[PDB]
Amino acid sequence: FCGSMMATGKILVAYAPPGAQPPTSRKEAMLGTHVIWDLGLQSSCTMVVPWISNVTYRQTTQDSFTEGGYISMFYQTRIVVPLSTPKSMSMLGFVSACNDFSVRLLRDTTHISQSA
Amino acid sequence: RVLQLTIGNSTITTQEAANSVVAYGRWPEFIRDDEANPVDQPTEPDVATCRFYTLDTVMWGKESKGWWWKLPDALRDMGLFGQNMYYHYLGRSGYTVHVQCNASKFHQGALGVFAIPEYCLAGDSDKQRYTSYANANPGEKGGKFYSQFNRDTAVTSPKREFCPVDYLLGCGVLLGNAFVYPHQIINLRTNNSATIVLPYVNAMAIDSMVKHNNWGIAILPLSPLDFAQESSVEIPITVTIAPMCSEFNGLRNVTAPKFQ
Amino acid sequence: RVLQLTIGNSTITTQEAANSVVAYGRWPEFIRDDEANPVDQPTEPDVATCRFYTLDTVMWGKESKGWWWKLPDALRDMGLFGQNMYYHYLGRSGYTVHVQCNASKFHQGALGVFAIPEYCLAGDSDKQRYTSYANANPGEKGGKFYSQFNRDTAVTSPKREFCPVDYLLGCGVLLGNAFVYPHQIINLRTNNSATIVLPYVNAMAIDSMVKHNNWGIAILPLSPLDFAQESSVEIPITVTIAPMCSEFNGLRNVTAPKFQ
Amino acid sequence: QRRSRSESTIESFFARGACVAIIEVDNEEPTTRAQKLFAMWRITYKDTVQLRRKLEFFTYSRFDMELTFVVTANFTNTNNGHALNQVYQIMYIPPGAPTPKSWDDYTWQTSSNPSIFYTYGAAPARISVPYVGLANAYSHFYDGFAKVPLKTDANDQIGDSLYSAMTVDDFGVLAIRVVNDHNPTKVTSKVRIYMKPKHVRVWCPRPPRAVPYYGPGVDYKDNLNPLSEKGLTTY
């Protein structure tokens, strides 16, 4: 969260394992694994999304049988902002991988192109 | 001699005991891996969900030709085991199919209890593998068989349902070869009850249960019931299923599939 | 310093950590009786039902006067803990009330978080103790308080609802004496979060939860929020409840109480 | 006892390798007819009947794979000019890799996808593939669906699925093209991929299919009389 020093708030980020409907609001999203992330004390969350899968290895294509899950972020509270402070705060987004990470079956990719 | 069969809280004893055939000779157990990376404990309702769930009663007649269920389809309507299946992502379970059918010393007729792992079924129309989800899962009332094959020709209103033939068993095999599955034959001459213990068999170690069905219980009348002189006669057949060593993992929001 | 508060699967950490007050100095535990006559194991979903359930968000204003919930009323609508409460006969549970309320450095105002065991309430009409079941349990949205006492005079249409007064706290005691309960004071000057751990307190060892309510969470505004110059301002207050060491016993059929 | 049972073990029961497919490949200009400049083949076992009924005794199985390519060719004109030797490129493609769309695309450069440049006239090529099942076994006869149409969906055409299909694209495709250029004459060539299993371990036997197959599923349409006619008391 790259906002001001004075503005605070609480943001809830959740995970939903697949096989259900997509989560839309806070009432049906807090059931899964979630982190009540704060803004006052620290300014960086950490969400170790676990490895809950029926198969051992999932695929890397959009296939409906082996689906990852869902990720949703909700306002826990309204962003309390004192006066004489901008109203449009901003938030970035990162990704990583822990030490239990592995792939197999090397192949070639699709993002590059050559029309010649 | 009399079996005192108690799993969990309920109890089925008997006035006369016959047999107990374990499928493939391996009793159901938990996950026993000392070098497993998740050593934290999932939810194992091992003494709080083992009630003997009893399905609906079907009336077996003379010209009726068979019944078939799916597991774990036949528990989604009732029982707290149904609530521990919609909320969680995946699980594993071992079943105790206990089919009883009592009648007098003067009846006759032979039944057959089956347990087919990965029991597929055939369609009816010329559209291949084209079957909706509501007809794919009969739930607790179960489907039936048919004597001869009668496909669909209407191209405007799609039926999208199964139509298996009894001596083809739905899959496409002969009936006389079906005894290589784990089975038990209710011969009405001697005994009236039967039971089968099923372990968890799947390619994975653990799987979802909404989009998958492990076992399919097929009941086939090997010889039709004839009474002394009449031509219409109704005795019931009642099937009881209980989970054993069941466990789940991965909570999510509630998922309610439609059933038309 | 920063609290890493993880019970079960979900996790509430913080940017700034303040306190954790255990009610009556005893951490929640199981049934520890070596000479107990039932040594068989009930259903203990101890690592499969400890999600941080979050109630609905109320908008705290200037002239708003308070909120109150009941436990285990506030979990009957949602969560698989709600399904393990209607089916079983009786249970026991320990709660983690975690009330957070964040605002800037320029606000003011003081809150008060309470936890009253056996929190009774007063009626409104002259008919004594005459209150229906739908108004007896607000569920997840929670009831409110009132500034002055305004009873009912209509004898044709019975209201049959509560009407507590805030500085009488519903029971009939002064507000200044309410701090002998386990409590925690959200002072908006320093900290923004608060938490209370509640053990199971009842006359029995174990009790039903449909017809009984152990804890009642009362939130009282000790000083009203004033901003710099304006007169209408809305900050939220969000309450989180999670069960700990919960267990149930005695399955039965599903019981759905009416809620008008 | 002196009866060697080891002739009919599982490694010897699948020791004979059979045919699985036949793939065409041509070499001419792209006309208004079917452009057979290259042909793709969906990798499956259930395209013949010698091997499908031989594998579908068994519910769950895991086994390593060995392929073999056989290449023959012909002509289309009587007194044709004598053409040269040819080079066929069998290129394997896993799922997610880009599908080639013409004779010479950038995806034919085999940037990382493993392929075999084959020379006509020499011995048949002979490659081996280890176990590529993502579960602990391959799954013959999957039952359920891939997707479940939920109650609060948009409509019924989104949540619909296909009965008994674990994956939309099962285990990738093959791709075969001629390296040499187009010619005024054309050389029709056929490729017969063979397949031999090894290291086979199976589970949970089931009775074999007897009425003939009808498409990739488990259903049936025709020839519903599997047994013949023979008198009862007559030998």
Ligand SMILES: CCO/N=C\c1ccc(OCC[C@@H](C)CCn2ccn(-c3ccncc3)c2=O)cc1
């Ligand atoms: C280096 C380049 O060329 N080489 C080859 C290559 C070929 C095939 C490869 O993958 C293997 C395939 C195979 C294991 C197939 C089989 N199999 C066994 C059951 N099923 C399957 C399952 C469900 N639906 C359809 C069939 C199925 O597809 C990999 C590499």
